[PDB]
Design a protein around this ligand. Structure first.
Ligand code: GDP
Ligand code: MG
Length: 155
């Protein structure tokens, strides 16, 4: 069956691409108009990720999280702070967190610049990569580095 059942959660404001980050990783499908499962071999061991996407029951058990904002809407990145506050009051301290700037294929509507976000993420000690669920930029290995950082910690 599997070796680990890693629970991940997805948080972000309305319409930053959470649902499509989930369907792009789990199903390779992107919808131009809740918990998903994938199983992958992280460092030999089979891992079955249960990936939640929108309250105690939401967070509890989560070994990992992806804080997602929308590159073209600066207000959704400002709210990464209130989100990080809610996350940390509900999960184990040593949860793997990755700041995610999605819709990075809208290169000319970027309202949140990378070094801005790389600065906040290093202050709050997060991992960070910009993604596109539309054309699958960095979707896969983002999830596989969250799940690989978690496997690092549990051994
Ligand atoms: N350009 C672009 N648009 C995206 C991307 N991901 C999601 N969207 C758009 O965001 C809208 C809804 O995103 P959704 O995943 O439902 O938002 P959620 O509420 O955060 O889950 C859809 O019309 C998508 O076209 C992306 O990677 N690139
Ligand atoms: Mg959603």
């Amino acid at each position: 069956m599997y070796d680990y059942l890693f629970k991940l959660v997805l948080i972000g404001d309305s319409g930053v691409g959470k649902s499509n980050l989930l369907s792009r990783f789990t199903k390779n499908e992107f919808n131009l108009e809740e918990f998903a499962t994938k199983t992958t071999k992280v460092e030999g061991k089979v891992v079955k990720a249960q990936i939640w996407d929108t309250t105690s029951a939401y967070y509890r058990g989560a070994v990992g999280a992806l804080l997602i904002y929308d590159v073209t809407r600066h207000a959704t990145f400002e709210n990464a702070a209130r989100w990080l506050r809610e996350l940390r009051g509900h999960t184990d301290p040593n949860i793997v967190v990755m700041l995610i700037g999605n819709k990075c294929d809208l290169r000319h509507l970027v309202a949140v610049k990378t070094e801005e976000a790389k600065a906040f993420a290093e202050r709050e000690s997060l991992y960070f990569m910009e993604t596109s669920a539309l054309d699958a930029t960095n979707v896969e290995n983002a999830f596989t580095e969250v799940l690989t950082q978690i496997h690092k910690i549990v051994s």
